[PDB]
Design a protein around this ligand. Structure first.
Ligand SMILES: Cn1nc(C(N)=O)c2ccccc21
Ligand SMILES: Cn1nc(C(N)=O)c2ccccc21
Lengths: 348, 348, 348, 348, 348
């Protein structure tokens, strides 16, 4: 017996939908859900989605509260819908997927992923839920995550980090590193060799290697000398050039984090969504150097060094394709006299 | 187990709230309630009230579907709230009362009218519901309607007409004429002798006496002669004067109905609500004669003739108080040389 | 180059979307689309749909302006989506279907009905458009209308009437009677033998047979005598019983139309959508007789007489299934001593 | 001391803004203004404008309640703003002009039309208000109406009809025929000789000449014979051709009114505003004959006959410019062998 | 070919409007603009203006992305509109000006500033754009900024800082110090001698002189002694008095910044807009000392010392007018026995 009042009761008493019986009085005004507490209204939810307020409230209450793959990974793997859960997209304040399976009567296209409507869709399956590894076996299209091995299936080791209630973290008390499996038209795929983005924040950036510790601690010329990076344009690409009106390079998150410690800057996230490569309209506060579309990727500095050192530097310009987060990322590589001039995630 | 989805189920299947178990998917967008039918959204309700949409939807679904007193009568009797029902005000598309008793969790001030919060409020009681006459005997303040005798309680015969789902009618298959009773501060109050407004429409006006048939059929001078109305200013008051820029008189609904048959006119209902006396900004289409505040009352022509013929015509101006629909209506009576000049419901 | 301003230009200059190049300034405020004319905003469209205002405006501008099947027929045939057109539902002021094919970038699930997403959906095809009969032959699921013969395809003669810009009519200058064809799972399905509802209004009801002329002109007892309808409960079913608080029978539109000429009544259309059988909360103004759920069907009186006279009258109660508008309508037939007591479209 | 509560007080007590002191409690929710009456909210105004609700409420309360020129006339004369009044556009439910002079603090561009901001704007002046003829003499740009002679100013006799509170009428108790005057760049402009549209409705159309009575009463062939209209294509232009899918002609309101008596039809007013020529998407209910853009003008049939009989019929196609409501209306005249084929207000 | 979809395409791909061809699907819901990215909606813009959402989205996309004068400077100079650009007011999240010239079809009053509508308006001209110095030469009213000298015009050196995408900064990689020119009625003005506000933030306050470094580093009594400020009430005016319920003085930003390092406080910006003097409802968290209207100005401490030391201290109270940011700021100076008691930006 699903209801607005029952969903609200669960949110008030359990912090989310927990299948508990009960009802609380609710008022809906514009895009906000309120509940009466001692005669006064208390805001439970503000709808930031394009779904009707009561529908969005229910999907948000029914969000997955276990560590789940980051939306950018699910998107890159072609996930269309999730089996009997809601992957909440905290970057968009909305459901990661248009439709649901066995979650909400307004958004459900099926109650079970075995229904023929789900056969063409790449359904997300969670091996931590009983019967989902078997539902993936019977699924024509799908992506499966597991914590351990699956008999007869070769795994693709996913990223170390997962999203837990919108907090991207590498789990110590919970497992966040999953094995990934994918099926297309009934055939188990061999997932490609991939790098993973590190999903760090600018304000709380932490190095994850000795090279990253050295980048943040040493001065530009000492670091470039120590790691033999002369001729690889790290001065432009990673450190950033703030001497002209157009901000030069600054495409690796670690470089932005190093700059942030000394001088602040504005990053306008004009397409706010989870993605492998992020585009920002940056304005450096100290210098006034700015760039409308500054593509930024958070790779481990060692992985970025490996990518750039594995390229042919003999052509003026070329597209360099690198598998990152299971997707093909195109980079633009610009060279002159055997040295790099610039290397950036291609704006297309 | 009250819920938005259960209220919607009742509306879809029973035409209103009928206490039936069940749920239908609902979407709320802005001020409208929708339900999915054959894959598409069908509008169930549009909120025209100042309450939250889901709350107004529930009160409207729980509206009283039996003949009930017209809102103007309840207002005139000082009714604040109803016992365990919703009197829906079809003229305002809203609940006739702010709060409820045992109806909706968001608007309820009590579950039963015996609760101390209800003692100062004039509670409406319906003798057609088991135990409501007893609740009126125990209520400190209240208005009771019955279809018959209550032992020891002196009745007041109400109007012949009642509102059934927004249709004001004199019941033939249902009883619409009720006995009325009122209590103030624990004491049964004697309801005054009163006239009743006829609650007719301009477009479907029907005469309810031989005098009313004669007013609509006969010419002005021959009706005034037949009913000995010379010197009573019916030419001004009832027929209306359309010769000057300011429309003269036209305060009885029957006069407007007679005019409507020949020439149309605009009546701007600037305070849209049910009331004994209605104020309209009238514009006569044929002549361009207009009046910002034209007070109009729908009395039976015989009752209006009785009122005007029972007045002393020896003073220039005076207030004439007449009990109509249990309320004291003040009229302004203007005389000259023993004849009426004007007589109108006094604009406060 | 589809755009809001181009859609608005087409509406302003062509009365609808006509593929014309051009732009007009547009302002969107809340759910209304406006355009500047002589320095002031003029309303072009008010969104009554659950889609975003600019999206609903585009689908409405792109509505099919040729005579099209009434939405009740498309629904009864299981139509999910239309091929490269919008069937506008004038009863709901909304698109008859959630999604589109080659119409609008926001609602499109495909550009052509040959795309694999369309295979499971029943696509509506219009033989009057070049290549649509061929697309139906290749579609896994679909409904096709034509003005003539399709080689080798067994036709089903549809209703005489079609909807032209929201006006249901039997075409004299245009063809409104189509041949219908349906495919399920790649296989042409034989459409059943069916009656058709007449799609008439209560206020402008016109008889379409000598029997219907006789029902409206003749008194109840003489019509029943002339057409040998004694023992078939037409007094209850068709004429209606207004003697008790619950309105009896009154399930045929013609009976409501006959009553409407003498006494008015309120019909509350609580699920406002096009359907073969309509449910109304009726309140008779003359008597106060009312019914929360009064199922009403508009059959030709001759067709209803044929249905009722073709039933076995020897059982107390039974479900009578009749194909109407291609759908199986369940009726409840109640008999006593070989005569009908009641016969009504069964309330689910 | 202008205020929302004071405006509301004036509306409640005076039917409009009347400069009276006082305040009533007001609640604003979404686009509606409410006031408390007997403990419940009563709707005073619903904003259908693109202005903020409280601002639109004030302009509507301050609307001119005297007969004023119809908005189509003011527009045709290039009126930008009114001097110290609001011309309310009842066809758009909005102010006819964006800005005000001495009316409302939010919309005012000036308190008096003598302010330099008003010099480039064509200000509407009303000679019925003291000092407005003088303000017109001093205005650089303006339109003046008067009920009589202004010394030395050559008058233009306007239409017989004016708008009084949204009712277009020819005044009997008030004057609706004004003298018009216009100034451009400090210089009094000679207004051209013009025809006037009759501003009639389809549903309440009344003939205003013996020819118009003869058009409505007589059959097509006998009217054309009586008025010697053979070869002028009245069969197409005025009567309308409903034999093909595209509705032919039907450009004079009187022809639509004649058709309306026999068969109803839908007129979609897709640009809802007052204009000399109106464009409708028409659908004839009887035949299914339709036209996306059907230009309709309401001229007196005698005036239309005079216009068409005053044209040279020797060229295949040409633009015929006719001054109507002070504006140049372009008509398309199509001839063959010395006879008219079609003549219609040219679709721009 | 301007369009909503084209503006959205530019925002998605270029970070702002860049004149690029292309379209993306857009949905408008309430006041938010979304775009579809891989089947899900992504928020592009939330309207915080009083303009229609699609219009505000276009002006925001077309905002000037070069360093521009701060809105307080433009306002103080009487700028009404900008020539072919949008000065976006980041403090109000809205366009700094009501109308535009050659920017957006809904807000444009002209395509070029040479149009006669622009002659009375003080048009903002940017010498960094080709032809704008010449358009200022031909403009009757205007303000011109340049980076270098203009032949024949004497410059007014503006502030060192400018706004770059809402970040107020003193440019190192870009020029932010402009020469200002102003014309009124065709005559080049001699701009007055002025101080400039420093436009610093409380949280990231940086000293811009040795005196400012000393104010932040030294204790109150050491600083007052070093700079000979005894008898100038800096203890009250600049440091602030937190000993009584009403917070005393605290009118210079540097004093608030010094306090902020030790104890936090709430500044309620009740009129959120860019202005030379800002008014805050301050509440000191440590003491509970508060003030409803605390006027705060950010002057360089040396400039404030120069202003206060250049006043006559012999009268109880007087208005001291100081040109700051080209506007006349009134200060209230209160003295006793030849010493200052208080000196503050006058609340009027
Ligand atoms: C070997 N194998 N294990 C699985 C599984 N655990 O889901 C599966 C699924 C499809 C095809 C082969 C498979
Ligand atoms: C001498 N002079 N230079 C300019 C200019 N560059 O705009 C100008 C403008 C108006 C009047 C005199 C002027």
């Amino acid at each position: 017996a699903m209801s607005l009042e029952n969903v609200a009761f669960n949110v008030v008493n359990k912090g989310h939908f927990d299948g508990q019986q009960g009802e609380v009085p609710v008022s809906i005004i514009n895009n906000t859900v309120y509940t009466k507490v001692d005669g006064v209204d208390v805001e439970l939810f503000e709808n930031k989605t394009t779904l009707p307020v009561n529908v969005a409230f229910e999907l948000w209450a029914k969000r997955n509260i276990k560590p789940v793959p980051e939306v950018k990974i699910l998107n890159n793997l072609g996930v269309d819908i999730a089996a009997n859960t809601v992957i909440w997209d905290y970057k968009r304040d909305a459901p990661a997927h248009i439709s649901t399976i066995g979650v909400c009567s307004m958004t459900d296209i099926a109650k079970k992923p075995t229904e023929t409507i789900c056969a063409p869709l790449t359904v997300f399956f969670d091996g931590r839920v009983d019967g989902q590894v078997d539902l993936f076996r019977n699924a024509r299209n799908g992506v499966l995550i597991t914590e351990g091995s699956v008999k007869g299936l070769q795994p693709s080791v996913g990223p170390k980090q997962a999203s837990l209630n919108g907090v991207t973290l590498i789990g110590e008390a919970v497992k966040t590193q999953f094995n990934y499996y994918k099926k297309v038209d009934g055939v188990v795929q061999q997932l490609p060799e991939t790098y993973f983005t590190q999903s760090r924040n600018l304000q709380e950036f932490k190095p994850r290697s000795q090279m990253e510790i050295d980048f943040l601690e040493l001065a530009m010329d000492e670091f470039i000398e120590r790691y033999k990076l002369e001729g690889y344009a790290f001065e432009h690409i990673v450190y950033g050039d703030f001497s002209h009106s157009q901000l030069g390079g600054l495409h690796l998150l670690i470089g932005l984090a190093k700059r942030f410690k000394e001088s602040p800057f504005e990053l306008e996230d004009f397409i706010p969504m989870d993605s492998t490569v992020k585009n920002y309209f940056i304005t450096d506060a100290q210098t006034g150097s700015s760039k409308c579309v500054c593509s930024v990727i958070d790779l481990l500095l060692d992985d970025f060094v490996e990518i750039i050192k594995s390229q042919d530097l003999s052509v003026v310009s070329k597209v360099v394709k690198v598998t990152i987060d299971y997707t093909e990322i195109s980079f633009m590589l610009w060279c002159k006299d055997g040295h790099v001039e610039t290397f950036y995630p291609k704006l297309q």
